[PDB]
Design a protein around this nucleic acid. Structure first.
Ligand SMILES: C[S@@+](CC[C@H](N)C(=O)[O-])C[C@H]1O[C@@H](n2cnc3c(N)ncnc32)[C@H](O)[C@@H]1O
Ligand SMILES: [Ca+2]
Ligand SMILES: [Ca+2]
Lengths: 1013, 172
DNA sequence: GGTGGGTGGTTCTGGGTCCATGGGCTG
DNA sequence: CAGCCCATGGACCCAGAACCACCCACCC
DNA sequence: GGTGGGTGGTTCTGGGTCCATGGGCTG
DNA sequence: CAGCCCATGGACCCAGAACCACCCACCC
């Protein structure tokens, strides 16, 4: 402290005044006390005059040695007499072998630190701030042991897959013993009513492998073998392990596993601080699941909260507890509950915040937590108990940790009955008056692919309450409010029975998502103050948005956006502060370290009518100008009163759910993948009903919800030959597609736009809402995919009724309104179509009404000329409608031979690269390296500005012709045949033709008015 | 002082032999050095360590620490030994070399002897806080007879002022 | 003796998809 | 009521790309 | 600026006792 | 036959002293 340094400065003055001597022996007591008292606060002790054998066999005795609790030297000190040249005397001592690892040579007026044999800092002892800084460095030096410990923790992560092989084999050999099978069967039945209705042998053997692994490491690196003999859960699971893990069996697996545990054990024994050894606990937690059960890791959310975030929330919760409730976290009465402990970070950091005089009571009856997995439970219980022990000096058992599903223990019951004590702890916790629900809830909206068969568990009660509150108040077609984070937020609101704060770190979707509009209406009615801190970081984005989002505050390890929020319940004041754009993870995490909650300048947010908190449209426009389509205009039967939009029917592009099995560049190749699919499907419907219903089939084919339902209904499929149709997959990418209802999940209303895939209709395809990419519009004459443009919404010119004809889709309402504003009965439907297209390419319209376009269907103005705009839209339309029939812009082709004449260099030199040659200023030079041999050049800079989305039209024809590896195993090993060499000549022509299209539209769009209506 | 400071010393003696692994005097002395130093700060004295004094013989002798006043005048001394020696045997040799005896705490980590005016006034066990706090009270308050007589003359005035004020009132 | 490949290791760093799945129709 | 439509945002990871370290070859 | 001396630590080195307690005697 | 003589060799340890490191007084 500066206070400690200031007392040294006084002590020194008194020694030379009350004593009369400036001899080093008499004046050294002033610094001895400074070092000794600083150390007593840092967990070290300055032991004076301790002899150390120098490297030259000689013995050297420094004036003082900083020593740890394991009697290990962490620093040194040698005082000199001011009547000498410190620099000169430093050399003499260092030449006799005085240690140079972390030594403070100090005369009464000047201090020198030589950390790692190099002078880190030289200060004057008359300056308090300077000495305090130099002393801090000396007292916080990282010794080689802690760096070797860190290095070995990093090796353990990569050697975990190989340790788990030995432990798996042991548990596999255990199922050859009837005693194990018996105990295993009793356990599965007990945990099928305590943990999860579908607890299976796989879950049981994972728990056993976790017990044996944690057992070894807790006795060797953490020196707490007793933990298991005092842990209720550990004693129910040692019953299962005692059947096989004993004697020769244990001695064998131990001799093999010692080659992984050896290094970590060695380094860890020279480490005293548990705050350094808790980095191994985090590693075991995150790496066990990643190596053993990657699937179970996704459903549980096995990730660790960076300390900076945890610390910040604990401090910010204390701030709002004093502001709205006039209480502190240390005050008796504030019961804090962590619904998902994980590694126990939140509870261990609370122990380090709570004052020692008050910690005892809090640890005994006010700090509570819940876990679902066994490894997390054990790691948390040890972390919590050992952090308490380090701070207090005595070891007490934490009797407030429960292995229970937080979202199932709503019995405020057999949940938590793994052991008898665990059930008591669960029933006791459900009666405690909780004031603060701090934590980092698991997040998981949906499973990634249906083949994973790893859907989120169903929580009847919570799901039923979400339906009545969040879902019922949401005007969205798709509800993603059954995310595990949304389920943990509903629970928290209900768990807080009276008043308090729910402090959580979660996906930032709630702030801005069409689906969380119900949450944004219900949260303001159950909380009085909402304080959101958006740390951005959404890497599921692209283009300039990705750069703006920046790094993730979770050490850039997750891709979703992160927000630290505090919901207090004492109108509702919603406060919102966003971290700056274009920041990095370290910057965001250091901001959380430095900034305190009081300093943050939150912005008051006023919800609008659709409950949108962030991103509110400027209500100073004439935006009520027409409408391209409306849900009501499409659902209406007859009557112009209910037909109030330019177009009637609108649809989204075909989504297949199996793009790699239904889309191919060649007609014949598709037919073969489709034949294989139908082939293996027809063998799946022959399986026993039990296996059909339990989805127990080899997942070589991609079975979506629809196919799984048909298979379980034993409905056979067949190959219709006239279903392979052309489709615009991505901009300028015409891949062939199998348009069949059986193998395409959702065809939407596209059967009525392009009948049977092959029909005659021209559609203006736009982006959907909310568009995270810039607004995009493209005209297509072939069935578009849902992802040609973000959430592509197609607006057709005709509408084919069932057993009917192409009824003009441009409504008669629009026709008249246009022939009335412009007073011209010549205006036709095939002219408004083209007018709309040109307006949607108007650069000033897309700029002024941007926020509007991102949230609504694009309402169209009434531009003065009509004729001029309809003409532009016709030119524009033809360029994209016939982009394969334009005049190829002359593009110079330069060719180069392979480096050598080996067959394998030719192979590595006809592989696609398709890279746009850029400059050191990252600006297109006007050249594309197609493969290793050919390089096209001559592209104008103008063509790099027709950007459909975040990519130019030209970057689209390069991206969708690269040889990407199929993400399906079967497709990659049986149907991956595309080689750029075969299509090289085609892409060369396509590039030149699209270069023309782009350079034309940059001109046509540029000649449009500079202002919008 | 008293209990608070002595009890901190008892914990510090333990932390030194635990974190250092040495029960040698040169290392364990820091405990009693800081007791004597912090008590002195509060009593307007300072414990200046290793101050060389001269004996009648002319032999220069350096006690472990001397209790100096604000006018650089010694008023007490301290010598620490290890627990692995006989305190009483080291005491004759110390005083034979020419060690002072007017006010000296000879102390090993387990026993403390206060010698005042040349005679052992008190012998306490450092394990008993109240006992040590008693001996240290006599050490820090031992005064030479000069100040003992001045203090007595101040008390004489407390019963002489009435008689003196009569004369001044009669003059007024 | 520098000096540029040759070879292998050791840090950053940039940058971005199709598709699950409840709810609302609907006939 | 089951059988259609309609959404809507998603708890990473990895190929270059330096950039070193070391040292054979190549000039110098 | 060594030098001797004060103080405490750290190796070596040298140098050596009364007295238990079973067995045979023995009158 | 229970007292009464007769051997006979013993699983360390701790004070002098040397000398060493460090710093203070003391010459130089
Ligand atoms: C992000 S981790 C907890 C993170 C914790 N704050 C930390 O710092 O380690 C999410 C954890 O929630 C636990 N969990 C507890 N109850 C759960 C439940 N009902 N459903 C899902 N996960 C649950 C999982 O086992 C998982 O370890
Ligand atoms: Ca010194
Ligand atoms: Ca001493």
């Amino acid at each position: 402290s500066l206070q400690l340094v200031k007392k040294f400065q006084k002590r020194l003055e008194d020694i030379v005044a009350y004593g009369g001597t400036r001899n080093e022996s008499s004046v050294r007591a002033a610094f001895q006390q400074l070092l000794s008292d600083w150390a007593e606060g840092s967990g070290l002790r300055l032991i004076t005059e301790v002899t150390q054998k120098a490297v030259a066999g000689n013995n050297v005795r420094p004036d003082g040695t900083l020593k740890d609790s394991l009697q290990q030297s962490r620093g040194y000190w040698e005082s000199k007499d001011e009547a000498d040249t410190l620099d000169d005397e430093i050399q003499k001592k260092l030449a006799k072998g005085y240690p140079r690892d972390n030594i403070i040579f100090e005369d009464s007026r000047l201090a020198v630190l030589m950390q790692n044999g190099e002078e880190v800092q030289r200060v004057d002892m008359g300056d308090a701030g300077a000495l305090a800084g130099l002393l801090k460095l000396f007292f916080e030096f990282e010794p080689p042991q802690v760096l070797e410990f860190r290095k070995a923790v990093d090796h353990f992560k990569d050697e975990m897959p190989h340790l788990l092989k030995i432990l798996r084999e042991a548990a596999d050999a255990a199922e050859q013993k009837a005693d194990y099978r018996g105990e295993r069967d009793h356990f599965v039945e007990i945990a099928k009513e305590a943990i999860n209705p579908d607890f299976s042998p796989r879950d049981a053997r994972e728990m056993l492998i976790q017990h044996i692994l944690t057992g070894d490491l807790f006795t060797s690196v953490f020196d707490n073998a007793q933990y298991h003999e005092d842990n209720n859960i550990a004693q129910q699971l040692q019953q299962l392990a005692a059947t096989f893990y004993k004697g020769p069996v244990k001695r064998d697996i131990a001799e093999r596993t010692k080659r992984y545990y050896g290094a970590i054990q060695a380094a860890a024994a020279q480490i005293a601080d548990h705050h350094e050894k808790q980095r191994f606990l985090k590693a075991l937690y995150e790496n066990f699941y990643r190596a053993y059960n990657p699937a179970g890791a996704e459903r549980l959310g096995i990730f660790y909260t960076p300390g900076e975030i945890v610390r910040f929330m604990i401090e910010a919760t204390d701030t709002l507890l004093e502001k709205h409730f006039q209480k502190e976290l240390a005050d008796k009465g504030v019961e804090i509950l962590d619904p998902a402990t994980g590694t126990g970070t939140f509870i261990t950091e609370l122990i380090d915040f709570l004052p020692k005089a008050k910690l005892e009571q809090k640890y005994r009856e006010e700090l509570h937590c819940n876990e679902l997995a066994l490894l997390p439970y054990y790691i948390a219980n040890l972390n919590i108990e050992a952090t308490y022990a380090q701070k207090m000096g005595r070891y007490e058992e934490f009797r407030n940790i429960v292995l229970v599903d937080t979202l199932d223990n709503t019995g405020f019951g057999l949940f938590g009955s793994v052991t008898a004590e665990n059930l008591e702890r669960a029933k006791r916790q459900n009666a405690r008056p909780v004031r603060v629900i701090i934590g980092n809830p698991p997040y998981r909206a949906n499973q990634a692919n249906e083949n994973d068969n790893n859907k989120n568990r169903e929580y009847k009660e919570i799901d039923r309450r979400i339906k009545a509150t969040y879902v019922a108040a949401s005007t969205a077609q798709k509800t993603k409010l059954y995310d595990m984070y949304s389920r943990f937020l509903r629970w928290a609101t209900d768990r807080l029975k009276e008043d308090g704060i729910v402090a959580f770190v979660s996906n930032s979707s709630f702030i801005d998502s069409r689906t969380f509009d119900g949450f944004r209406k219900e949260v303001v009615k159950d909380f009085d103050h909402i304080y959101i801190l958006d740390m951005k970081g959404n890497a599921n984005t692209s283009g300039e948005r990705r750069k703006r989002e920046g790094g993730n505050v979770f050490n850039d390890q997750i891709k979703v956006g992160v927000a630290v929020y505090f919901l207090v319940r004492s109108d509702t004041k919603i406060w919102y502060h966003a971290v700056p754009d274009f920041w990095r993870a370290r910057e965001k995490l250091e901001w959380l370290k430095t900034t305190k909650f009081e300093d943050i300048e939150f912005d008051h947010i006023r919800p609008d009518a659709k409950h949108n908190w962030l991103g509110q449209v400027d209500e100073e426009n004439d935006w009520n100008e027409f409408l391209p389509v409306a849900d009501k205009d499409t659902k209406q039967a007859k009557g112009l009163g209910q037909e109030r939009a330019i177009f009637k029917l609108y649809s989204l592009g075909v989504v297949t759910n199996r793009d790699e099995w239904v889309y191919s560049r060649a007609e014949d190749e598709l037919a073969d993948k489709v034949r294989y699919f139908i082939g293996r499907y027809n063998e799946i419907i022959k399986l026993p009903l039990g296996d059909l219903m339990s989805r127990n089939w080899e997942g070589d084919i991609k079975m979506t919800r629809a196919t799984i339902a048909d298979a379980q209904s034993r409905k056979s499929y067949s190959l219709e030959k006239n279903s392979i149709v052309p489709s615009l997959y991505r901009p300028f990418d015409v891949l062939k597609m199998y348009f069949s209802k059986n193998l395409n999940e959702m065809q939407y209303q596209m059967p009525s736009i392009f009948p049977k895939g092959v029909g005659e209709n021209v559609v203006i395809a736009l982006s959907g809402s909310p568009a995270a990419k810039p607004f995009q519009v493209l005209a297509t004459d072939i069935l578009p995919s849902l992802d040609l443009l973000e959430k592509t919404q197609c607006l057709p010119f005709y509408r084919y009724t069932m057993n009917g004809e192409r009824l003009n889709n441009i409504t008669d309402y629009a026709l008249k309104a246009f022939q009335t504003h412009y007073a011209d009965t010549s205006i036709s439907r095939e002219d408004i179509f083209h007018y709309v297209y040109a307006v949607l390419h108007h650069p000033a319209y897309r700029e002024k009404y941007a926020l509007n376009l991102r949230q609504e269907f694009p309402r169209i103005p009434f531009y003065p000329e009509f004729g001029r705009w309809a003409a532009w839209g016709r030119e524009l339309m033809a360029l994209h409608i016939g982009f394969e029939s334009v005049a190829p812009y002359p593009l110079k082709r330069t060719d180069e031979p392979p480096k050598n004449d080996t067959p394998e260099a030719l192979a590595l030199a006809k592989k696609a690269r398709l890279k746009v040659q850029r400059d050191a200023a990252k600006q297109p030079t006007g050249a594309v390296e197609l493969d290793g041999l050919t390089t096209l050049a001559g592209i104008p800079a103008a063509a790099w500005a027709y950007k459909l989305g975040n990519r130019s039209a030209l970057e689209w024809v390069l991206e969708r012709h690269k040889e990407t590896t199929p993400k399906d195993a079967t497709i990659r090993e049986k149907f991956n045949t595309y080689r750029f060499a075969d299509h090289k000549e085609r892409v060369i022509d396509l590039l030149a033709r699209v270069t023309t299209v782009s350079v034309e539209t940059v001109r046509i769009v540029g000649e449009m008015p500079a202002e919008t209506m | 002082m008293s209990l608070q400071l002595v009890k901190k010393f008892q914990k510090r003696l333990e932390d030194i032999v635990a974190y250092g692994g040495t029960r040698n005097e040169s290392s364990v002395r820091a405990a009693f050095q800081q007791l004597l130093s912090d008590w002195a700060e509060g009593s307007g004295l300072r414990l200046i360590t290793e101050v060389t004094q001269k004996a009648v013989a002319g032999n220069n002798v350096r006690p472990d620490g001397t209790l100096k006043d604000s006018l650089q005048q010694s008023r007490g001394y301290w010598e620490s030994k290890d627990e692995a020696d006989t305190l009483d045997d080291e005491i004759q040799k110390k005083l034979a070399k020419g060690y002072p005896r007017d006010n000296i705490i000879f102390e090993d980590s387990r026993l403390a002897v206060l010698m005042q005016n040349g005679e052992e006034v008190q012998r306490v066990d450092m394990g008993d806080a109240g006992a040590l706090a008693g001996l240290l009270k006599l050490f820090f308050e031992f005064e030479p007879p000069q100040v003992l007589e001045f203090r007595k003359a101040v008390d004489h005035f407390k019963d002489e002022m009435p008689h003196l004020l009569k004369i001044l009132r009669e003059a007024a």
